[PDB]
Coordinates of N, CA, C and O and ligand atoms in Angstrom, one line a residue:
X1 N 106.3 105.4 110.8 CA 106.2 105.2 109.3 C 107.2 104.1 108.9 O 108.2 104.4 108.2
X2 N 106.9 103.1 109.3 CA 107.5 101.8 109.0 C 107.9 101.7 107.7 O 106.8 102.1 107.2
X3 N 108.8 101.4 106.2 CA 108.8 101.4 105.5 C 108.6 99.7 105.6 O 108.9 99.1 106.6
X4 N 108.2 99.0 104.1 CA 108.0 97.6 103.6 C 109.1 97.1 103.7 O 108.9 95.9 104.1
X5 N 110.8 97.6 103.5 CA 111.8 97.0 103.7 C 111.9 96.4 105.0 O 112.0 95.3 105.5
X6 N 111.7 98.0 105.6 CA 111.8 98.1 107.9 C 111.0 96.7 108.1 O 111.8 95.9 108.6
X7 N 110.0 96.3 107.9 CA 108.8 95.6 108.4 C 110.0 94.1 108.2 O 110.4 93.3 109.1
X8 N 110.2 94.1 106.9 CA 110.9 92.7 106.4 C 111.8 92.2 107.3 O 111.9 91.1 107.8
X9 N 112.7 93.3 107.5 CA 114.2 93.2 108.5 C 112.9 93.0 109.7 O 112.2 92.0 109.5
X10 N 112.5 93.4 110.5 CA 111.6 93.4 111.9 C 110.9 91.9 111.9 O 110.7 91.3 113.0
X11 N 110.5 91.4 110.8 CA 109.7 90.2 110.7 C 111.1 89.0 110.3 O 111.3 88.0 111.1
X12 N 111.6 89.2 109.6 CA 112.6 88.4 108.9 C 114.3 88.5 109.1 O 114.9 87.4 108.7
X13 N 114.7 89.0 109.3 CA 116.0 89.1 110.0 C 116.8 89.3 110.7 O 117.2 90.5 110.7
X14 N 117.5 88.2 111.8 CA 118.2 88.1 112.8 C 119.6 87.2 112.6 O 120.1 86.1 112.8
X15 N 120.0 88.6 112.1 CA 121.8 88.6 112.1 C 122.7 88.3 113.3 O 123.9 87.9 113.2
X16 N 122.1 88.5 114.5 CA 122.9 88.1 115.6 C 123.3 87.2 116.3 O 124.1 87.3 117.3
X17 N 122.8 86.0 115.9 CA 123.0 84.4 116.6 C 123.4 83.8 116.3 O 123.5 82.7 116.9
X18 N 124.0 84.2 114.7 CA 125.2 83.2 114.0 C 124.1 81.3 113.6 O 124.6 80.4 112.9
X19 N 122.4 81.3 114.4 CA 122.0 80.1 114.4 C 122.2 79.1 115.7 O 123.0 78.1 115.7
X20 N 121.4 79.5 117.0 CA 121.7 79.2 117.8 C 120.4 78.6 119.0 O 120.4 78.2 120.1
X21 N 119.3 78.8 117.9 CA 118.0 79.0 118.4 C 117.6 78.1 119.2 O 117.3 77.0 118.8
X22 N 117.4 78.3 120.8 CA 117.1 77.1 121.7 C 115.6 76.8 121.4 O 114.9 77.3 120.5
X23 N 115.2 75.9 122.5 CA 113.5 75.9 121.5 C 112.9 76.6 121.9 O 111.7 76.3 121.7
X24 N 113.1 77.8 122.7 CA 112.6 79.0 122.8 C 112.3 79.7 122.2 O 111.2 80.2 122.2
X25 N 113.3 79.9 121.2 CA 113.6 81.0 120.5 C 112.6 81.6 119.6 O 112.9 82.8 119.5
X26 N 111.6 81.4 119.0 CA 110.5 81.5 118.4 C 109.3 81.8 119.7 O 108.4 82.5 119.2
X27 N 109.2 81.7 120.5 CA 108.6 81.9 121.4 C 108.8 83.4 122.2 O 107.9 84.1 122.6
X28 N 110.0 83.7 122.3 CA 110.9 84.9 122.6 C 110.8 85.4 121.3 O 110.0 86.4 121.2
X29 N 111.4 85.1 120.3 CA 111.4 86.1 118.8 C 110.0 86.6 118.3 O 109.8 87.7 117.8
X30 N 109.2 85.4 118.5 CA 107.8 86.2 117.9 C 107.2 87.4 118.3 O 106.7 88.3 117.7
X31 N 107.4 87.1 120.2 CA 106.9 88.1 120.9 C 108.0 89.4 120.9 O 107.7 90.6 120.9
X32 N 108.9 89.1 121.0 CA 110.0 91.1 120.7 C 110.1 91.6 119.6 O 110.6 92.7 119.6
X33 N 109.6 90.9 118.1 CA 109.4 91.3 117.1 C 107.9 92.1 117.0 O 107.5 93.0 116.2
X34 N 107.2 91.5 117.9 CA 105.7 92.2 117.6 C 104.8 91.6 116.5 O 104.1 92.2 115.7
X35 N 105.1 90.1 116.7 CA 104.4 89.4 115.7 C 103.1 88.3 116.4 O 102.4 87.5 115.9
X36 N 103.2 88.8 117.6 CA 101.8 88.2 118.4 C 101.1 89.2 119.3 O 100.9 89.0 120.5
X37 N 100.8 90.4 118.5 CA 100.3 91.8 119.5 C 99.2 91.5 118.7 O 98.5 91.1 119.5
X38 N 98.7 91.5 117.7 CA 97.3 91.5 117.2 C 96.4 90.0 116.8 O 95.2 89.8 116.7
X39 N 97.7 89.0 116.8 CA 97.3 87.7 116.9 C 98.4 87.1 116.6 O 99.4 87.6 116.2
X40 N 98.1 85.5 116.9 CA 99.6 84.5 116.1 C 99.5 84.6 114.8 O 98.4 84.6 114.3
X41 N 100.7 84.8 113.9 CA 101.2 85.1 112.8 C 101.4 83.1 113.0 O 102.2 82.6 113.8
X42 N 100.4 82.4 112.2 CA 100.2 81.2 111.8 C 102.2 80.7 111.8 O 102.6 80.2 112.9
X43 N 103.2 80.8 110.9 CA 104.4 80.9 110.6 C 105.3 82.0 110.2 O 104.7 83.0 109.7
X44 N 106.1 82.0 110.3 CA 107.4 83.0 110.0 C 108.5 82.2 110.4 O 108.6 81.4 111.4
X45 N 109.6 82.7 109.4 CA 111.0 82.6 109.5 C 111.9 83.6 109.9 O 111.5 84.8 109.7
X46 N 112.7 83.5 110.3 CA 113.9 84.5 110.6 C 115.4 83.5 109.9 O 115.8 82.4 109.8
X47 N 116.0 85.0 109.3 CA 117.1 84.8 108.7 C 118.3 85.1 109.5 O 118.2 86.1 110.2
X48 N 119.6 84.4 109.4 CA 120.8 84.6 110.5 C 121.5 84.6 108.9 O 121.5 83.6 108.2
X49 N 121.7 85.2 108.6 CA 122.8 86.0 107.6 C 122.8 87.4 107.5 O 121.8 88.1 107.8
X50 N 124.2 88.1 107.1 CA 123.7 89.5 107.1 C 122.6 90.0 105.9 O 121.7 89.4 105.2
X51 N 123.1 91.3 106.3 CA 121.7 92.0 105.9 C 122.0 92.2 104.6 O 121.2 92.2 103.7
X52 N 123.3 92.5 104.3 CA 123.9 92.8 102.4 C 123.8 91.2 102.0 O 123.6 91.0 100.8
X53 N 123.8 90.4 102.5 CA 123.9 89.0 102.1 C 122.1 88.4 101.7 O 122.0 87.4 101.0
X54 N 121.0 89.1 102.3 CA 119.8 88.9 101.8 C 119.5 89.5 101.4 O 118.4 89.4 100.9
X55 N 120.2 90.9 101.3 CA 119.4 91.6 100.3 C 119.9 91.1 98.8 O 119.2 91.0 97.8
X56 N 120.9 90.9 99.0 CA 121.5 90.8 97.8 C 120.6 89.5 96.7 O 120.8 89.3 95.5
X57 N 119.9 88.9 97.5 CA 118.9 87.9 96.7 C 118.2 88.3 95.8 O 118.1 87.7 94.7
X58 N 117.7 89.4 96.3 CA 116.8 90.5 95.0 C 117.9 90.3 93.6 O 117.3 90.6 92.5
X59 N 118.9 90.1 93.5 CA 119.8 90.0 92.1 C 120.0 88.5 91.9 O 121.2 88.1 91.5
X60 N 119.2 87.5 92.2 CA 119.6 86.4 92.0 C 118.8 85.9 91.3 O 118.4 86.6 90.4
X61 N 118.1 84.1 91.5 CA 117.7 83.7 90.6 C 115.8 84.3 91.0 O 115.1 84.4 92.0
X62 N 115.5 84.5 89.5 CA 114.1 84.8 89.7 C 113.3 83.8 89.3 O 113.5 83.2 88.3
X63 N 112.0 83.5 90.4 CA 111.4 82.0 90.3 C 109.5 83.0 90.4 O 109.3 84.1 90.9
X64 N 109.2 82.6 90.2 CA 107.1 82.2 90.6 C 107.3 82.2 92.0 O 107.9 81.4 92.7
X65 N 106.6 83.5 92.3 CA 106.0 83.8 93.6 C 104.9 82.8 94.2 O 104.0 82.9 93.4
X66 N 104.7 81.9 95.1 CA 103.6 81.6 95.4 C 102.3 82.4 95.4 O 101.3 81.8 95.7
X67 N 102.3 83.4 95.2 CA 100.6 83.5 94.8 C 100.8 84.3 93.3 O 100.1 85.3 93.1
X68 N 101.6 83.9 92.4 CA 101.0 84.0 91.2 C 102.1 85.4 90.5 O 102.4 85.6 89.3
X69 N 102.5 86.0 91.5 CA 103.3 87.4 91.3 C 105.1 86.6 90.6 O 105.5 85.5 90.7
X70 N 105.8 87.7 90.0 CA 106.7 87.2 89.8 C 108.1 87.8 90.1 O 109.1 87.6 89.5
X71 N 108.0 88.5 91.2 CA 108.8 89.3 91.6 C 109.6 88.7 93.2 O 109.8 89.4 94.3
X72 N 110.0 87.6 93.0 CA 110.6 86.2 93.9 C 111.5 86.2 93.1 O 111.6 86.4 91.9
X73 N 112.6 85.9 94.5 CA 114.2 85.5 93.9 C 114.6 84.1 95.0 O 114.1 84.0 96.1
X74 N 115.3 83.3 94.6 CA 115.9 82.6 95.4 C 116.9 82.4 95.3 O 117.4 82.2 94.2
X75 N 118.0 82.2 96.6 CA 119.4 82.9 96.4 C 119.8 81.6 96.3 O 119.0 80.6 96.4
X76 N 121.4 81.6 95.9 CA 122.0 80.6 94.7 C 122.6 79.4 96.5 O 122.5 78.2 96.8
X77 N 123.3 80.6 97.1 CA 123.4 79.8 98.8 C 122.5 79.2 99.2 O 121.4 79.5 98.6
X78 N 122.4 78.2 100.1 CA 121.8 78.1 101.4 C 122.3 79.1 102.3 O 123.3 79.8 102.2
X79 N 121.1 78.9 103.5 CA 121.5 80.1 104.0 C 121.0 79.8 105.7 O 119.8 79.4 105.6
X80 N 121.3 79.8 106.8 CA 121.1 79.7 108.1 C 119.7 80.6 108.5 O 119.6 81.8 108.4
X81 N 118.8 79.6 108.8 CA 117.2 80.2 108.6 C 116.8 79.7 110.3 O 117.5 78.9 110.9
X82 N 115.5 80.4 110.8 CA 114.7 79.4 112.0 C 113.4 79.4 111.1 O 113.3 80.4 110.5
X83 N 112.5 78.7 110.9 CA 111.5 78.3 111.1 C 110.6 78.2 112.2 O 110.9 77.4 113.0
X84 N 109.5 78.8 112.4 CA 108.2 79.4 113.7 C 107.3 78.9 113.1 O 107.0 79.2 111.9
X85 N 106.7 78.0 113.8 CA 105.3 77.3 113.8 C 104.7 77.3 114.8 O 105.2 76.7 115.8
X86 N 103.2 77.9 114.9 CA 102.9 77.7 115.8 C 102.3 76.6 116.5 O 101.6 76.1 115.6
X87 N 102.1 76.0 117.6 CA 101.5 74.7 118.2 C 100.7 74.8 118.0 O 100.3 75.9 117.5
X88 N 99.6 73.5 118.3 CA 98.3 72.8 118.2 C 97.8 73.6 119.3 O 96.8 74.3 118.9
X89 N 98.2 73.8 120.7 CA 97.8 74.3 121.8 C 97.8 75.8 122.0 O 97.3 76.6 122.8
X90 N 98.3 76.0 121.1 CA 98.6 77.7 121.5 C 97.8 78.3 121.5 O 97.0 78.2 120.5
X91 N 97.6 79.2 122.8 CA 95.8 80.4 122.6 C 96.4 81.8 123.2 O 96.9 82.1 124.3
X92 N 96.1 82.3 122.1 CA 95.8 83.9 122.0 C 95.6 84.5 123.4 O 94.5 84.1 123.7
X93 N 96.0 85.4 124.3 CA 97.4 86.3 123.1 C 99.1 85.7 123.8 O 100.0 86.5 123.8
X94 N 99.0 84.3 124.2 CA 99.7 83.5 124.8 C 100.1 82.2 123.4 O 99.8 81.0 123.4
X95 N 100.9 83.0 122.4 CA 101.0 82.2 121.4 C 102.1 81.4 121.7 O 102.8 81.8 122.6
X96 N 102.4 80.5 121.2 CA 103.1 79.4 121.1 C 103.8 78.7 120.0 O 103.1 78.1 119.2
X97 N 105.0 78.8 119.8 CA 105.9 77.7 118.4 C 106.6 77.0 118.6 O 107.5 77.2 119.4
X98 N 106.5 76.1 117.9 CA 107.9 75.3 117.9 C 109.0 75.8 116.9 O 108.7 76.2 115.7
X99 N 110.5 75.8 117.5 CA 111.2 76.4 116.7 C 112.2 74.9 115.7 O 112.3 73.7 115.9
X100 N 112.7 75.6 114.8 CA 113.1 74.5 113.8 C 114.3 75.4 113.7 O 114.0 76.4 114.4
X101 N 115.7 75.4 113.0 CA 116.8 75.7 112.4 C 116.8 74.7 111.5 O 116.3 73.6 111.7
X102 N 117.5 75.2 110.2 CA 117.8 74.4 109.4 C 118.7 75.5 108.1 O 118.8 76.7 108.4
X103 N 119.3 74.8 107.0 CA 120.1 75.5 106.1 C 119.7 75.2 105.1 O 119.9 74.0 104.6
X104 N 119.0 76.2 104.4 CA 117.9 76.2 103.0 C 118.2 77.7 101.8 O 118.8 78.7 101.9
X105 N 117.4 77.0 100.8 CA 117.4 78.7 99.8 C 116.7 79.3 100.3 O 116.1 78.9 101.3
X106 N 116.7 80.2 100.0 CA 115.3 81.4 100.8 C 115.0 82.1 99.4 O 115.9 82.7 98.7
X107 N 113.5 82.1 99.2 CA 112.5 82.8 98.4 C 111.9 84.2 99.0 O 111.1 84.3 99.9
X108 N 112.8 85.5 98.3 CA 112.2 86.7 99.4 C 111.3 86.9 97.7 O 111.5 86.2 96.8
X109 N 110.4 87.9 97.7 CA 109.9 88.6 97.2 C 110.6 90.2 97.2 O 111.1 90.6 98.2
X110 N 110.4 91.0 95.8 CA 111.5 92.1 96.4 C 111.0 93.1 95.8 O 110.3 92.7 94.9
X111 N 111.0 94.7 95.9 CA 110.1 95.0 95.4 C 110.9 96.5 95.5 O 111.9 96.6 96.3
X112 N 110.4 97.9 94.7 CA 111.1 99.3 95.4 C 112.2 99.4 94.4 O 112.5 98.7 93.5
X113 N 112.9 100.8 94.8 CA 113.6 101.5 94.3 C 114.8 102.2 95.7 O 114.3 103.3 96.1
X114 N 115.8 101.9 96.3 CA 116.1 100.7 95.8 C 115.4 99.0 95.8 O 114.5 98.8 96.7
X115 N 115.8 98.2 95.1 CA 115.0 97.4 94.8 C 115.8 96.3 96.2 O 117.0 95.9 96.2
X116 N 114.7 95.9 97.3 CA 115.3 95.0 98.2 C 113.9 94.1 98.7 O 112.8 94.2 98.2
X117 N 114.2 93.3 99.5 CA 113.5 92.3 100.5 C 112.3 92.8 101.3 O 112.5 93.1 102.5
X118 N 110.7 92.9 100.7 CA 109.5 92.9 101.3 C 108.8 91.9 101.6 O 107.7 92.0 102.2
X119 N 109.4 90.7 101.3 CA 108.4 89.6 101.9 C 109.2 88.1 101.8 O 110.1 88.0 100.9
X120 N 108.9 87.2 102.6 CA 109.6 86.1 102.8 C 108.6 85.0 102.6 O 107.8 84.6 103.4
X121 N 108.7 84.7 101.2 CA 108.1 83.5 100.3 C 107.9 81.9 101.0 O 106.9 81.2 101.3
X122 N 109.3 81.8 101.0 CA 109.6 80.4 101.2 C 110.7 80.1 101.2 O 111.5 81.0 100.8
X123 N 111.3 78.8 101.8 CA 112.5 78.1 101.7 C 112.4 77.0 101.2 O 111.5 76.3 101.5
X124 N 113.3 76.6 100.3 CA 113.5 75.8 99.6 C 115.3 74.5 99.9 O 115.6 73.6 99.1
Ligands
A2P1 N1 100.5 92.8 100.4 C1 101.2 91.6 100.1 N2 101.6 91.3 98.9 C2 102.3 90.2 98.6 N3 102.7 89.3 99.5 C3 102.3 89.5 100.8 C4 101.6 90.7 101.2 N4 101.4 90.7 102.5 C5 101.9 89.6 102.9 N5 102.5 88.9 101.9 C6 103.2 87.6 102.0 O1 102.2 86.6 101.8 C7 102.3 85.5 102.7 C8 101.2 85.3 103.6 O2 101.1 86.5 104.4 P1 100.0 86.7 105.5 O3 100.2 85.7 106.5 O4 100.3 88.1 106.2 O5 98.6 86.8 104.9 C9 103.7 85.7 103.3 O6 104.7 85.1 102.6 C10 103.8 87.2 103.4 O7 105.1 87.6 103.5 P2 105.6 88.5 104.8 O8 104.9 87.9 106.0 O9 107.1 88.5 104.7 O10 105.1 89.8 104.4

């Protein structure tokens, strides 16, 4: 019984590498997160900040959700991110990404009581 928060940390945050992502790392991360067991997850991000440090976005600036909802924050930091894309070549259930690092806002969506991090919008 996964809760929506659990899923976010499981999909979205990796506190442990300080940002170190070889170009593996999306390749390895997709697959031990369990984000290529039912198919490639087209993109995803992973966050290298703590976990009180993204949650705490949910109290920051509030912006327009990309599909229309308004319950998006983007934090006032930049923040140590990877970026997962997957390749032109990649075939199922042998997925494939290229990994990116870079230092951006991050757009979570946030939602609950307590009120934290269910979904990862965008970086800005
Ligand atoms: N039930 C939902 N309500 C709102 N946003 C969602 C929901 N499920 C997924 N998302 C988010 O919508 C976008 C597209 O998702 P998808 O690829 O699964 O269709 C992603 O940013 C995803 O965030 P996340 O993947 O962090 O949940």
């Amino acid at each position: 019984k996964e809760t929506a928060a659990a899923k976010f940390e499981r999909q979205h945050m990796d506190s442990s590498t300080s940002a170190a992502s070889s170009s593996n790392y999306c390749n390895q991360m997709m697959k031990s997160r369990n984000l290529t067991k039912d198919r490639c997850k087209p993109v995803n991000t992973f966050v290298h900040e703590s976990l009180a440090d993204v949650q705490a976005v949910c109290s920051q600036k509030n912006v327009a959700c990309k599909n229309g909802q308004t319950n998006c924050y983007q934090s006032y930091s930049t923040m140590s991110i990877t970026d997962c894309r997957e390749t032109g070549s990649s075939k199922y259930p042998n997925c494939a990404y290229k990994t990116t690092q870079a230092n951006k806002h991050i757009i979570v969506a946030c939602e609950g009581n307590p009120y934290v991090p269910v979904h990862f919008d965008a970086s800005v």
